């Protein structure tokens, strides 16, 4: 019905997700034309997938349902403010809007601080917790060349 | 002094607009008795007015010139199909007719797509992207009441 009810459904999902031991306190919902096209819950541990956050799980499901890779005319509801990873996913997916209940400071007080990642994505590379090394390969442009060449390429941007 | 030349003029204003850095690619003119009464251009950024679209501007100026709030006997020539708020403004301004060159499609292929607003306007308040709330007040009818008297 209204944004509250859907967002309410997302928080309910997070709770059921916890009590059922499938994952962390995160839930998400994606709707299109007033229909809940997907429901996601954080299931990182229970499915050995560090990228399995509520929003990422809902996106994957939502796209599978639409047999598409873009979430046009869709709205994403998360029980809490998206993580940087989950944010990049939002922008690659392209929903027209996103709503969230709990803030990231709330997640931090709970033991789920994603701040260290905002700090790192802001740094260069060589200056990072996890060291990033850029190796010089004479053929580093090869895959872009193979792409310019491939005719039947389905552009996804 | 011809339908085509007036529309052409709106388009010429549309270009000058972009060029002079005064705003987006949109121009409009209103004519009365074969003469151009007012001109508008998209100047939203340069005047801090998000309602400052070409058509909207052109009719505000015209109404001022004519000292009226209805343009019941004027024509609007606009460089492109009107935005929805512009259509609303047109239905309130009430001109004889309106001409346009570019269509809502041409503008969409330039980063200017209003269709999302069309969709939104159709959807009831609850479904709209932007959050809408209808709190109920025990006197939410008093303004109309006060109107029934005046
Ligand atoms: Zn996340
Ligand atoms: Zn407009």
Swiss-Prot record, chain B:
Cofactors demanded by this protein: Zn(2+)
UniProt pathway: Purine metabolism; guanine degradation; xanthine from guanine: step 1/1
Keywords on record: Hydrolase, Metal-binding, Purine metabolism, Zinc
GO biological process terms, semicolon-separated: guanine catabolic process; purine nucleoside catabolic process
Family the entry assigns: Belongs to the cytidine and deoxycytidylate deaminase family.
Gene3D superfamilies for this protein: Cytidine Deaminase, domain 2 (3.40.140.10)
Domain CMP/dCMP-type deaminase: from-to ranges: 1-132
Binding site residues for Zn(2+): 53, 83, 86
Induction trigger: Expressed only during limited or partially limited nitrogen conditions. Can be induced to high levels in the presence of purines or intermediates of the purine catabolic pathway. Expression seems indirectly controlled by TnrA and GlnR.
Protein name per UniProt: Guanine deaminase
Primary role: Catalyzes the hydrolytic deamination of guanine, producing xanthine and ammonia.
Catalytic activity of the protein: guanine + H2O + H(+) = xanthine + NH4(+)
Source organism of this protein record: Bacillus subtilis (strain 168)
